[PDB]
Chain A
Amino acid sequence: SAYGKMLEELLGPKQTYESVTRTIGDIVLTPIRKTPWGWPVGFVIAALGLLMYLFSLAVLFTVGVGVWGINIPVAWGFDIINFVWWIGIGHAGTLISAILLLFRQDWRTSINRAAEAMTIFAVACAGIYPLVHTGRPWLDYWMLPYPGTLGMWPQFRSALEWDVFAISTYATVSILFWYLGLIPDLASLRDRATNIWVKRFYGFLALGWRGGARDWNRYEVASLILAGLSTPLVLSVHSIISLDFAISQLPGWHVTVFPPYFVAGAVYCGFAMVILLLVPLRRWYKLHDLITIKHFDLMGKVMLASGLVVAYGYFAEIFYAWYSANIYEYFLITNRTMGPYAWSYWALIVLNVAIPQLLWFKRFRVSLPWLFFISICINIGMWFERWVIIVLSLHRDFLPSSWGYYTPSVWDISLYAGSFGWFFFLFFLFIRLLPAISIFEVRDLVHKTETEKALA
């Protein structure tokens, strides 16, 4: 049937419930020192990247926030370009896990946890920059509302006060919706462990899951509503992060279309990171029977449906800069196209509007070497968008006597390139400790493929 021809393109040749469990119950529950190579010599490169993270933080806390090369015109440099970037990555991990659950689509089941757990670790590296770019990080509890023996409360008019309410909600909701999606799987890992103190570990995480006829109905409504709550959440988290630029009167920042273009940029850069992390998980970890090439064909289309709202945002920011008869937004066009950071706006149009237009053609989407090259070109390209928006619009603004440059210091590089350590330290821990791909959601779409094969 026409419905079976799209289900059979997401799974391998033949799969049963104990086969989809064994395929994921062998990437986990394999013994330590039987764990595959490339993980420990990938977890060490990730741990050495974490020692660069905790040392670029210990140098930042001790010496100051001014080891970053941030000037006074451009006080927001890599610390916020990488905050909006890292949180932008995490938004298309929930568009897979939560927004696609609204559309009841099934190409999300295999890429569910490898993107939902990708969100959290892209928030654990994005939730640190608003806690560390402050000059006095120890007083970051002042951005929280609490009766604190001095009548001051946070402002609730600035988007850095909505950030600590978006990032903290995005954290403790994409964690709970991720931990919700694990209690059935951690019950599969517990029942299949055959190792005391390993069965107890997953038996403690999967609280009492039990399966259950009614426990599954309460799950299907808790997972649907959480998916229906993480759809306006991530539509607002990178819209609130969008508003720490759009509530400022700066020329390149007060662009009103930032909310539906930062969200479109977060889904754009996020699917690039999902593809960058699944082509290795599909190749190295033998998950060819679960993460089929139709998942990348569709991720390349959703990464295209978002990349055209970004490539539209580059025009709704150029046109309405010109359409605004301001001297200061006319200059915005003649400061990005020309100017000292002209190459930033041209290593951006090339990397978001020229190179990733190949996602239109199935020749450049099914072919994973191109989808992996376009995803590299988007993650770098969507970093330059966050550099064009922040630094290229700050360093040349009103009052020409306040024009800086922001050459980033070594402690911006040794913190951003070390942030990938804290991302892969957790992402390699998640692969080894937890199922790197949903089990019951892949038990379904196997029960759904046999249910459709039953009629035909």
Chain B
Amino acid sequence: RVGNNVGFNAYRLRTSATPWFGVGLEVAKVGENYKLASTQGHFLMEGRKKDLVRYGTLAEYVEDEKFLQVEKEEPISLIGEYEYN
């Protein structure tokens, strides 16, 4: 009842001689719109590096360990502070 009609059975395209890749494909779109439920949405780091996954390279990590840790002062917070001992 779960995988009963999740479409595109890709097993009916193999050949048993080219079972993993073949170069005889004709695409020829015959459809207009499909649902294609994906969870993410935007697949681009919209300039929001330093808040999303920060990247670098070992070429610039051996020369400066804290090369992507931004040096920011202690942010002011009006809303108290609780201790978790």
Say if the two chains contact directly (CB < 8 Å): yes
Find the B residue at minimum CB distance from A330.
B47
Across the two chains, which residue of chain A brings its CB closest to B41?
A403
Interface residues of A in 370-410 (CB under 8 A from B): 396, 398-404
The yes or no answer to A328 lying at the interface (CB within 8 A) is: yes
A73→B52 CA distance, assembly (Å): 17
Which of A399, A400, A402, A403 gathers most chain B CB within 10 Å? A400
Task: Please tell me if A67 contacts chain B, counting CB pairs below 8 Å.
Answer: no
**Which residue of A is nearest B47, CB measured?**
A327
Instruction: Chain B residues near A78: list those with CB within 8 A.
Output: none
Mark each residue of chain B from 41 to 65: 1 if its CB lies under 8 Å from any CB of chain A, else 0: 1111111100110000000000000
Q: Give CA–CA (A327, B41) in the complex, Å.
A: 19
Q: In angstroms, how far is the closest chain A Cβ from the Cβ of B38? A: 11
Interface string of A307-351 (1 = CB under 8 A from B): 000000000000000000001100100000000000000000000
Chain A: minimal CB distance from B76 (Å): 15
Query: Which residues of A lie under 8 Å from residue B85 when comparing CB positions?
Result: none
Q: Count how many chain A residues have C-beta atoms less than 8 Å from C-beta atoms of the other chain.
A: 12
Q: Which chain A residues border B47 with CB–CB below 8 Å?
A: 327, 331
Residue B40 at the chain A interface, CB threshold 8 Å = yes
Verify A328–B48 contact, CB threshold 8 A.
yes
Total contacts A to B, CB within 8 angstroms?
29
Cα distance, A400 to B52, chains bound together (Å): 9
Question: Would you give the 0/1 interface string for B14-48, flagging 1 where the beta carbon is closer than 8 Å to chain A?
Answer: 00000000000000000000000000111111111
Closest to B49 in A: A327
Residues of A within 8 A of B40 (CB): 401
A404 CA / B41 CA spacing, docked (Å) = 7
The distance from the CB of A395 to the nearest CB of chain B, in whole angstroms, is 9
Q: Bound complex: CA of A400 vs CA of B46, how far in Å?
A: 7
Cβ of B48 and Cβ of A401 under 8 Å apart?
Answer: no
Question: Are B41 and A398 in contact, CB atoms less than 8 angstroms apart?
Answer: no
Q: Are B42 and A327 in contact (CB under 8 A)?
A: no
Chain B nearest Cβ from A334, distance in angstroms: 10
Measured in the bound complex, the distance between the Cα atoms of B47 and A311 in whole Å is 30
Q: Is the CB of A398 within 8 A of B48?
A: yes
- B-side contacts of A328, CB under 8 Å: 48
Q: Which residue of A lies closest to B39 (CB)?
A: A401
Residue of B nearest to A405 (CB): B41
Of residues B44, B46, B47, B48, which shows the largest number of chain A Cβ atoms within 10 Å of its Cβ?
B46
Cα A327 to Cα B43 with chains together (Å): 17
Min C-beta distance of A73 to chain B, whole Å: 8
Q: Which residue of B lies closest to A71 (CB)?
A: B41
Cα-based distance from A401 to B44 in the complex (angstroms): 8
Task: Report the bound CA distance from A138 to B47 in whole Å.
Answer: 43
Q: Which of B42, B45, B51 contacts A403 (CB 8 A)?
A: B42
Q: Give A398 to B41 CA distance when docked, in angstroms.
A: 13
By beta carbon, the residue of chain A nearest B42 is A400
Distance to closest chain A CB from B6 (angstroms): 22
Interface residues of A in 398-428 (CB under 8 A from B): 398-404
Minimum C-beta distance from B32 to chain A (A)? 18
Query: Nearest-CB distance from A338 to chain B (Å)?
Result: 12
Structural contact, B41 and A402, CB atoms closer than 8 A: yes
Binary contact track B63-80/A, C-beta < 8 Å → 1, others 0: 000000000000000000
Chain B neighbourhood of A398, CB < 8 A: 48, 51
Bound-complex Cα distance A404 to B38 (A):
11
A289 to chain B: closest CB distance in Å? 58
Kindly identify, within residues 84 to 116 of chain A, every residue whose CB is under 8 Å from any CB belonging to chain B. none
Look across to chain B and name the residue whose beta carbon is closest to the beta carbon of A401.
Answer: B40
Which of chain A's residues has its CB closest to B44's CB?
A: A400
Q: Are B46 and A401 in contact (CB under 8 A)?
A: no
- 17 A-B pairs (CB sep. < 8 Å): A73-B41, A327-B46, A327-B47, A331-B46, A398-B51, A399-B48, A399-B51, A399-B52, A400-B41, A400-B42, A400-B43, A400-B44, A400-B48, A400-B52, A401-B40, A401-B42, A403-B42
Query: A interface vs B, CB < 8 Å?
Result: 73, 327-328, 331, 396, 398-404
Q: A327-B47, A328-B48 are in contact. List 15 more A-B contacts (CB 8 A).
A: A327-B46, A331-B47, A396-B42, A398-B48, A399-B48, A400-B42, A400-B43, A400-B44, A400-B46, A400-B48, A400-B52, A401-B40, A401-B41, A401-B42, A401-B43
Leading 4 A-B pairs by shortest Cβ distance: A403-B41, A400-B42, A403-B42, A401-B40
